[PDB]
Amino acid sequence: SMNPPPPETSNPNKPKRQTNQLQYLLRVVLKTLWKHQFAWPFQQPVDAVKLNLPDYYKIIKTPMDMGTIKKRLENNYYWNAQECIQDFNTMFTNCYIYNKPGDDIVLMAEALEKLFLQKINELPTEE
Numbered sequence: 001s002m003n004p005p006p007p008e009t010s011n012p013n014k015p016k017r018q019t020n021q022l023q024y025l026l027r028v029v030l031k032t033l034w035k036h037q038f039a040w041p042f043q044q045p046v047d048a049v050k051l052n053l054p055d056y057y058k059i060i061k062t063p064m065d066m067g068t069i070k071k072r073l074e075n076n077y078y079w080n081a082q083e084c085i086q087d088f089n090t091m092f093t094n095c096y097i098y099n100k101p102g103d104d105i106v107l108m109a110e111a112l113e114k115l116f117l118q119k120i121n122e123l124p125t126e127e
């Protein structure tokens with residue numbers, strides 16, 4: 001009946017960097033997934049109130065979405081590429097945990113995840 005606050009995208013006391021891998025995660029990985037025809041459900045936090053899914057944030061205790069990831073990358077919120085990759089994987093996994101296997105939303109996440117894996121396969125060596 002209420003949404004939780006979204007994940008943070010700024011934290012001044014959290015150490016952060018820009019690395020060439022993090023730049024790749026923004027310029028190649030996020031950009032590729034964001035433009036995809038099936039990106040739209042993943043471009044912002046789940047609005048469980050509008051969807052009338054009061055159980056969503058009972059099941060999903062570590063929400064993540066590409067809106068959040070985009071803002072984190074734009075703010076250079078991360079220390080390393082692994083932290084950002086973890087956020088994408090959390091997003092996909094949440095979708096697979098909550099939804100019925102085979103449902104259209106799962107097919108959408110799978111399409112995005114296939115591209116994600118293809119891009120991080122070519123993550124550049126650091127520096």
Ligand SMILES: CC[C@@H]1C(=O)N(C)c2cnc(N(C)c3ccc(C(=O)NC4CCN(C)CC4)cc3OC)nc2N1C1CCCC1
Pocket residue numbers: 040041042044046047050051053056094095098099105
């Ligand atoms: C929650 C479980 C499951 C899931 O795992 N995810 C991730 C999921 C996410 N979103 C949606 N839906 C439909 C949305 C899609 C897009 C938007 C969107 O565009 N919002 C924009 C925000 C900014 N404004 C200016 C314009 C509108 C909104 C959404 O819902 C309110 N459905 C999802 N499903 C399922 C798929 C079908 C039944 C629920």
